[PDB]
């Protein structure tokens, strides 16, 4: 009989994990402020890691990696990629980004304008995007981007002006992959991803066809749900499209780059978040987001620390979380692809 607490009610993923643990008959849920737990489904903000691992006779486990926000914040991800030698200043799979602080507050304003003038001097695609962790503007003029941020920390990166467009539709999309890292820092990639597609035709010259967010496609888009159900294309249908249209497969053309990016990001921060010799153990489910261009090259957009799964994949993924991340520590009485690496 194991015990666990719940400190995040808004978690749609671990609400199902908490439901499955109780269904096994070998897990008993406690109050959210009870310290005698084996597992903590902690909160997003200000998780008390300092109080974990100090209960005698209790192996404690938490569903978040302390220090993983270095990878799941817009400003932190750009700073991590430029400064880490493992990722280097020259990164092929990450769009050229810059950290810009508002003028009412290090900053990279003078460095961002240097590469912008190079793209103005030589006739190239000079369309950028501004965003933050908290409102997005896509303007080819640097003055409209800088004036917009001044109106919290933001990041400006190169906007992929030649994205891979699905037919019929001639539309943008992005790929969400769910990655689970257990206490042993094994990297498991869920075999099932989703293509969050746009329903409007991509117009290179209104931010509906340019943004593939689910909330924007359900409110501002007009052809929502026309081509695929809920603007979500799974890997089986997408693999068939690549074979019919581009004479290639999802594994070779895209999935190899995706698995390479996931390994590089997590191996980089491994010495800083690893709970290998720590008094408590940590696992965490991640949501990697990718953009594919017409050259079939995969780019990393952002990483999510508290991701929400797809509706069809909740049952299978949450069951896989219990198997390799929970029952591997607390045994009772594969849907993942392991990404091997040198620990």
């Amino acid at each position: 009989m194991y015990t666990f607490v719940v400190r995040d009610e808004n978690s749609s993923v671990y609400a199902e994990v908490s439901r499955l643990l109780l269904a096994t008959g070998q897990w008993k849920r406690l109050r959210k402020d009870n310290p005698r737990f084996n597992l903590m489904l902690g909160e997003r903000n200000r998780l008390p890691f300092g109080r974990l691992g100090h209960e005698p006779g209790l192996v404690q486990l938490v569903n978040y990696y302390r220090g993983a926000d270095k990878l799941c914040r817009k400003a932190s991800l750009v700073k991590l990629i430029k400064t880490s030698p493992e990722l280097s200043e020259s990164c092929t799979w990450f769009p050229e980004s810059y950290v810009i602080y508002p003028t009412n507050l290090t900053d990279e304003r003078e460095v961002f304008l240097a590469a912008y003038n190079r793209r103005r001097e030589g006739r190239e695609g000079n369309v950028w995007i501004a965003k933050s962790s908290a409102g997005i503007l896509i303007s080819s003029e640097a003055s409209e981007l800088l004036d917009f941020i001044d109106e919290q920390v933001h990041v400006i990166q190169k906007y992929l002006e030649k994205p891979l467009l699905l037919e019929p539709g001639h539309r943008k999309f992005d790929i969400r992959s769910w990655v689970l890292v257990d206490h042993l820092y094994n990297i498991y990639l869920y075999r099932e991803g989703v293509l969050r597609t746009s329903s409007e035709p991509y117009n290179s010259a209104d931010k509906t066809c340019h943004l593939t967010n689910h909330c924007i496609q359900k409110e501002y888009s007009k052809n929502y749900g026309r081509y695929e159900e809920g603007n979500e294309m799974f890997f089986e249908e997408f693999n068939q499209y690549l074979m019919d249209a581009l004479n290639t497969t999802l594994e070779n053309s895209i999935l190899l780059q995706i698995k390479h990016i996931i390994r590089s990001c997590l191996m980089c921060i491994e010495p800083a978040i690893s709970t290998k010799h720590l008094h408590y153990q940590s696992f965490q489910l991640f949501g990697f987001d990718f953009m594919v261009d017409e050259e079939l090259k995969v780019w990393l957009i952002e990483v999510n620390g508290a991701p929400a799964c797809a509706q069809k994949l909740y049952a299978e993924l949450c069951q896989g979380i219990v198997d390799v991340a929970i029952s591997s520590v607390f045994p009772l009485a594969s849907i993942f692809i392991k990404l091997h690496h040198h620990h």
Binding site: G50, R51, H54, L278
Partner: protein, 438 residues
């Protein structure tokens, strides 16, 4: 030469001082009867070991220590122990009724009846000092005497010795060996009133010492004797520079300078390695790189915390044994490229290294094995604030219901001193977060 006076308060303070002075004598070659054959200067001297020992005409080397316990059962063991001849009865102060794990009882009720006696016995040892550095206070957080009387002693010591430094060796409470439920109360009550009176405090979480004895010494149920022999090794490494020739941490002022840039943030983290069991017949001797790499493993620290998520303000490496400066720099360079060591932007990213060629001394028949080299790292990291967060949480749980508070009010203490102490700890936690987090 400048003398240092040790003060041992409460059961934990006395029994730890009993183990440190035992280890001090084995290092300096002092025999239980106070005789020291290697000391050629009979009856006096200004050597580096005289900072901890006085000398009599007969040649006895008397420790500059004072033992204070509110009940006589523990110090009576020192009066009849193996080293009963080191100390004279003036150094051993005992009452008849302990503070009963009540801070207010040891600070106000019983501490008042004996505070003027202790200071008079401390003044007798200060009158034998040509240049007193300061005091080293050994006490526990959870005990009524270790917390209640110590804070009252630290207040009076600042009045009688304002220009002197005061260092603490504190025992953080751990339920696996704790004897009272209200120890979170006593720990925060005594940290509040002593914070402005301590220049540098070395916390020792009994939880960490307990597991180090279980993990690295194969001890099933560690006793106080097991814990205190390991603690004395850490204390001996910290005080080795005051008792031996050298140039790093040569006086008490150098501890505050090299480890405490901010006065309130004066709780350095101590990490010690290697801890080898004497029951193992043959063990592979660890190198300089291997024992320096162990200083950044949380399983070897005196307080379990994660220095990866916290910035550094200082770092000392105190080596004892076959260590040369070339091997140290080779270890630091390798560690810097494979570890997460972040300093605050207003401090240099560097290490102060101290090497003593004499390897660590082990108590004969003890649990620790003889090693060829060992290192104790003193790092002032903001990650040690996790210990305050754990303690402040247990305080808030009980105080929300005013549990056990009547025991403290019944001894003349006001209820407002509880919240006044917790508000100070809330400020202490906030001071760490401004320095260690972005």
């Amino acid at each position: 030469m400048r003398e240092c006076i040790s003060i041992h308060v409460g059961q934990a303070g006395v029994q730890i001082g009993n183990a440190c002075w035992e280890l001090y004598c084995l290092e300096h070659g002092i025999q239980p009867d106070g005789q020291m054959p290697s000391d050629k200067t009979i009856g006096g001297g200004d050597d580096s070991f005289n900072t901890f020992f006085s000398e009599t005409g007969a040649g006895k080397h008397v420790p500059r220590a004072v033992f204070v316990d509110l009940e006589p059962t523990v110090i009576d063991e020192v009066r009849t122990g193996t080293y009963r001849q080191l100390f004279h009865p003036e150094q051993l102060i005992t009452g008849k009724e302990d503070a009963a794990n009540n801070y207010a009882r040891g600070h106000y009720t019983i501490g008042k009846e004996i505070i003027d006696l202790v200071l008079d016995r401390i003044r007798k040892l200060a009158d034998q000092c040509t240049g007193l550095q300061g005091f080293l206070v050994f006490h526990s957080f959870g005990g009524g005497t270790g917390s209640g009387f110590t804070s009252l002693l630290m207040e009076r010591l600042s009045v009688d010795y304002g220009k002197k430094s005061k260092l603490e060796f504190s025992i953080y409470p751990a339920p696996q060996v704790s004897t009272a439920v209200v120890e979170p109360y006593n720990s925060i009550l005594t940290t509040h009133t002593t914070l402005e009176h301590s220049d540098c405090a070395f916390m020792v979480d009994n939880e960490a010492i307990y597991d180090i004895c279980r993990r690295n010494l194969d001890i099933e149920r560690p006793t106080y004797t097991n814990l205190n022999r390991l603690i004395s090794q850490i204390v001996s490494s910290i005080t080795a520079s005051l008792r031996f020739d050298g140039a790093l941490n040569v006086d008490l002022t150098e501890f505050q300078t090299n480890l405490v840039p901010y006065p309130r943030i004066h709780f350095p983290l101590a990490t010690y390695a290697p801890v080898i069991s004497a029951e193992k017949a043959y063990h592979e001797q660890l190198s300089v790189a291997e024992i320096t790499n162990a200083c950044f493993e949380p399983a070897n620290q005196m307080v379990k915390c994660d220095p990866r998520h916290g910035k550094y303000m200082a770092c000392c490496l105190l080596y004892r044994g076959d260590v040369v400066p070339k091997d140290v720099n080779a270890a630091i360079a390798t560690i810097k490229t494979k570890r997460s060591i972040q300093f605050v932007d207003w401090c240099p990213t560097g290490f102060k290294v101290g090497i003593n060629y004499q390897p660590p001394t082990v108590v004969p028949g003890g649990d620790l094995a003889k090693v060829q080299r060992a290192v104790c790292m003193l790092s002032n990291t903001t990650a040690i604030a996790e210990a305050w967060a754990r303690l402040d949480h247990k305080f808030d749980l009980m105080y929300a219901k005013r549990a056990f508070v009547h025991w403290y009010v019944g001894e003349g203490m006001e209820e407002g001193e509880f919240s006044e102490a917790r508000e100070d700890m809330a400020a202490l936690e906030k001071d760490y977060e401004e320095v260690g987090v972005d």
